[PDB]
Amino acid sequence: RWILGDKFDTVFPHKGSLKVLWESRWKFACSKSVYPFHDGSIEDFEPIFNHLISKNINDAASDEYTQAFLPTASALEEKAAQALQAGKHEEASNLLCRAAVVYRISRFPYVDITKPNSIKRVAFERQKQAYLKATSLWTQPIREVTVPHTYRTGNDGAHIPIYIRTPAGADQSNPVPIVLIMTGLDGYRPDNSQRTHEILARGWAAVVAEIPGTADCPADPADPASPDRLWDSVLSYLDQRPELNTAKMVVWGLSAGGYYAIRAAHTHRDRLLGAIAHGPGCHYYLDPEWLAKVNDHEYPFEITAAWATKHGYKTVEEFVAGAQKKFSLVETGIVDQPSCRLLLLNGVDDGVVPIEDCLVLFEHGSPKEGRFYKGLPHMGYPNSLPVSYEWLEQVLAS
Numbered sequence: 001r002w003i004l005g006d007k008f009d010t011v012f013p014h015k016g017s018l019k020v021l022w023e024s025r026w027k028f029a030c031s032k033s034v035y036p037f038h039d040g041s042i043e044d045f046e047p048i049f050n051h052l053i054s055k056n057i058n059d060a061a062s063d064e065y066t067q068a069f070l071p072t073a074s075a076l077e078e079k080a081a082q083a084l085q086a087g088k089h090e091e092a093s094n095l096l097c098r099a100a101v102v103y104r105i106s107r108f109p110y111v112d113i114t115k116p117n118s119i120k121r122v123a124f125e126r127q128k129q130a131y132l133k134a135t136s137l138w139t140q141p142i143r144e145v146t147v148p149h150t151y152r153t154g155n156d157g158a159h160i161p162i163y164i165r166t167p168a169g170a171d172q173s174n175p176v177p178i179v180l181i182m183t184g185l186d187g188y189r190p191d192n193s194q195r196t197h198e199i200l201a202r203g204w205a206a207v208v209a210e211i212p213g214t215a216d217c218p219a220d221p222a223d224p225a226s227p228d229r230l231w232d233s234v235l236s237y238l239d240q241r242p243e244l245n246t247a248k249m250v251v252w253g254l255s256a257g258g259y260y261a262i263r264a265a266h267t268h269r270d271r272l273l274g275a276i277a278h279g280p281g282c283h284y285y286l287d288p289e290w291l292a293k294v295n296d297h298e299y300p301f302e303i304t305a306a307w308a309t310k311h312g313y314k315t316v317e318e319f320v321a322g323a324q325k326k327f328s329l330v331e332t333g334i335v336d337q338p339s340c341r342l343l344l345l346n347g348v349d350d351g352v353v354p355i356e357d358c359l360v361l362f363e364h365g366s367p368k369e370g371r372f373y374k375g376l377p378h379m380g381y382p383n384s385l386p387v388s389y390e391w392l393e394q395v396l397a398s
């Protein structure tokens with residue numbers, strides 16, 4: 001039925017086993033300091049995962065999992081304080097970024113927007129504080145701006161916290177192009193250090209905003225219209241920033257962010273030069289058949305509970321029954337209008353969202369651009385990263 005093929009029916013060996021996850025995948029990912037351990041260090045995680053495996057802790061959503069990381073995070077914060085006192089700004093920055101990753105992994109896979117007393121919310125708050133302290137020491141610092149949500153309606157919150165980083169010499173005389181990153185289910189505004197490095201390196205500004213139903217996004221998750229209002233507020237603020245050129249602006253949707261990159265490519269086409277949708281869902285990811293086996297694939301932990309909450313549902317049952325007709329960009333007709341240039345990047349063997357959710361967009365509206373990696377799972381890393389920057393360079397060219 002699915003392009004994923006036989007692999008669709010495979011129960012992946014890490015399912016309900018943190019031991020297998022660490023020993024097969026995450027240990028190596030952590031060593032290489034690649035996603036989701038980017039900015040991180042194996043020195044910090046080896047003892048934590050040894051602990052979790054020794055206690056047979058497998059459920060990431062449990063407090064037993066989360067609170068096993070916080071003592072390490074504390075030790076790194078004190079080491080950073082000791083580094084700062086001695087005027088070692090580089091080491092302090094590194095140690096605080098390392099602390100941020102310990103917090104990050106601790107609140108995987110999802111910070112529950114509806115539970116503000118949750119230990120995963122606490123960890124996320126500590127992460128943001130540690131990250132902003134770390135990036136404050138950078139030559140080009142990451143700055144937080146609380147953008148007033150002027151376009152808010154109904155159940156929308158008042159404040160849009162975004163991260164902004166501008167390249168050396170960004171001036172109103174010659175305002176710089178903008179890459180607006182839309183983050184995902186387990187990646188929020190502090191989880192994009194290397195992306196901001198690569199954007200500034202090519203002389204562009206990096207802007208990072210969370211998506212509806214995650215982190216500190218004020219958009220009503222249960223209202224499919226809410227992201228349209230969110231970007232109206234975000235883009236209005238960037239219009240007003242003298243050193244940022246909204247005439248040369250691309251959006252970069254990361255995993256769950258991909259949906260909102262595709263949506264914005266249509267809704268805000270006359271305000272964007274381009275959009276990248278990186279491992280996106282838009283339709284078939286909400287098919288009950290697909291949702292029946294999504295928890296059995298490459299995502300480190302159970303995803304269906306987090307997805308239900310992110311889509312503004314009170315139960316997984318209601319989410320499965322309703323989500324597709326309500327949120328599908330195909331079903332709702334968002335795809336049946338022109339779009340700005342839209343690059344679609346994924347692994348063909350994505351078991352989190354189907355490759356069909358890229359291929360479907362070629363049957364609607366404007367021509368779409370795509371590169372799909374045969375054999376690779378969700379996101380198609382690391383192959384899909386170089387081509388992203390090549391495409392940005394072409395779209396934002398002089």
Ligand SMILES: O=C1C(O)=CC(=O)c2c(O)cc(O)cc21
Pocket residue numbers: 035183184185186187188191254255256279378379
């Ligand atoms: O694969 C994911 C993923 O599964 C969830 C994400 O949110 C994410 C992200 O924010 C950035 C990434 O580079 C990758 C991911």
